[PDB]
């Protein structure tokens, strides 16, 4: 099996710059078969490149192939407001077809720390049995950010999930939302509940905090 | 050109079987290697297995190369996917993809790659069932920018969809993607940012739809 290793993860730029993409094979990719791919939210993937350098009818010609063997490249001359996208590298020079993990390309801003908000869980959902406390963080940049949830200042760690949204089409930042989940009785063994974030924007680390009926 | 017509998203069982259907319309179905592509939520693309109809010449995934048929029928230019033994951790958007030719027609030789994608098919395998969510305010705290929202929480399947003001409220919202909760429910939350002084005097309603249950709420948002 060929595996295909994408770099970078992410790439931060900005609308007008030019964006280099590499695509590293563990071993020759035979008759150079790379393809490059190109993935909106809720959108199939549209067919970039081909033949590692050919370009099928209808793509931009800011979008150019190059390499062979085991290095590829997807290059972006000029990047354009609708480029910013997810890009995957597949070979198909063995019968045996692979992706790569796939390269996200972002608008790059100033760094913005979140505004963090805290929610207590309501009166309606306590009487059915479960306890949800809601750690918001709103409109920051970059989209890497740390949540540690506290229960009287004790470090929570199994019992939460996040979820981030897609950067936002007109200040280009991230929103975060973990969402902390006790049994109610769990729930009210305890009094300070807690949620601590920790960003690039933010100097020290901000603990935003309610106190359990207060 | 040509098109690709997968058929409807369906939920299936654990250890059950599905079939993906996928209907071409255009150049030739017999000469270009149809493949399926599948790519579970927030995770990248996997390829799966392909198929040369003239000569039914199939090629599986060692992933997996056991529970995977892929068959294409000339008759109806319709290409299918049988997954078996189903979990969940399969639970994936299925594309399927027909590779490209060299430009257009006649003369127009396979490039291999694939130019050609279908809208693609929703399968989500889970052992719950169809389930109307609970909507929990997310009341803002007792400057400058104030936070408020509600919590969808415990529904199946997706999705929902979250308006604020029946539509009229738009600025500084943010709907989250939905996580899977443990119990094989989903939960999302929708939050918005506000004036501080408008807390006491504008109302912040939330209209939650789970149209596979049939369920709408519009559940009040107000400072405790």
């Known amino acids: 099996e060929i595996v295909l290793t994408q770099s970078p993860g992410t790439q931060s730029l900005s609308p007008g710059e030019r964006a280099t993409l590499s695509c590293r094979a563990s071993?020759?990719?035979?008759?150079?078969?790379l393809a490059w791919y190109q993935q909106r939210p809720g959108q199939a993937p549209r067919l970039l490149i081909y033949?590692?350098?050919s370009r099928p009818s209808g793509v931009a010609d800011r979008f150019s192939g190059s390499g062979s063997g085991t290095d590829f490249t997807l290059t972006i001359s000029r990047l354009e407001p609708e480029d910013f996208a997810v890009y995957y590298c597949?070979?198909?020079?063995?019968?045996?077809?692979?992706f790569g993990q796939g390269t996200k390309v972002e608008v790059k801003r100033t760094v913005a720390a979140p505004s963090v908000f805290i929610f207590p869980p309501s009166d309606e959902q306590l009487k059915s049995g479960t306890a949800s406390v809601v750690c918001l963080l709103n409109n920051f940049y970059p989209r890497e950010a740390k949540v540690q949830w506290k229960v009287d200042n004790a470090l929570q760690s199994g019992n939460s999930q996040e979820s981030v949204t897609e950067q936002d089409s007109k200040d280009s930042t991230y929103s975060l939302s973990s969402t902390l989940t006790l049994s109610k009785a769990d729930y009210e063994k305890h009094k300070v509940y807690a949620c601590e974030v920790t960003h690039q924007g933010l100097s020290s680390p901000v603990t935003k905090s309610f106190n359990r009926g207060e | 050109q040509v098109q690709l017509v997968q058929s409807g998203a369906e939920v299936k069982r654990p250890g059950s079987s599905v079939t993906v259907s996928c209907k071409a319309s255009?150049?030739?179905?017999?000469?270009?290697?149809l493949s399926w592509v599948r790519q579970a939520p927030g995770r990248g693309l996997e390829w799966m297995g392909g198929?040369?109809?003239?000569?039914?010449?199939?090629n599986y995934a060692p992933r997996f190369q056991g529970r995977i048929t892929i068959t294409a029928d000339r008759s109806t230019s319709t290409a299918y996917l049988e997954l078996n033994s189903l979990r969940p951790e399969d639970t994936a958007v299925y594309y399927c993809?027909?590779?490209?030719?060299?430009?257009?027609?006649?003369?127009?030789?396979?490039?291999?790659?694939?130019?050609?994608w279908g809208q693609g098919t929703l399968v989500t395998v889970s052992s719950a069932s169809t389930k109307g969510p609970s909507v929990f305010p997310l009341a803002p705290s007792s400057g400058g920018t104030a936070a408020l929202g509600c919590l969808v929480k415990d529904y199946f399947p997706e999705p929902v969809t979250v308006s604020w003001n029946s539509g009229a409220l738009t600025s500084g919202v943010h709907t989250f993607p939905a996580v899977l909760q443990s119990s094989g429910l989903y939960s999302l939350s929708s939050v918005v940012t506000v004036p501080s002084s408008s807390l006491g005097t504008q109302t912040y309603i939330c209209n939650v739809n789970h149209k596979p249950s049939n369920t709408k709420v519009d559940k009040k948002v107000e400072p405790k």
């Open positions: 993809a027909r590779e490209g030719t060299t430009g257009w027609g006649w003369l127009g030789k396979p490039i291999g790659a694939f130019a050609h």
């Open positions: 033949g590692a350098s």
């Open positions: 198929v040369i109809p003239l000569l039914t010449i199939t």
């Open positions: 255009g150049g030739s179905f017999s000469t270009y290697a």
């Open positions: 597949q070979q198909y020079g063995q019968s045996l077809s692979t």
């Open positions: 071993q020759s990719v035979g008759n150079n078969k």
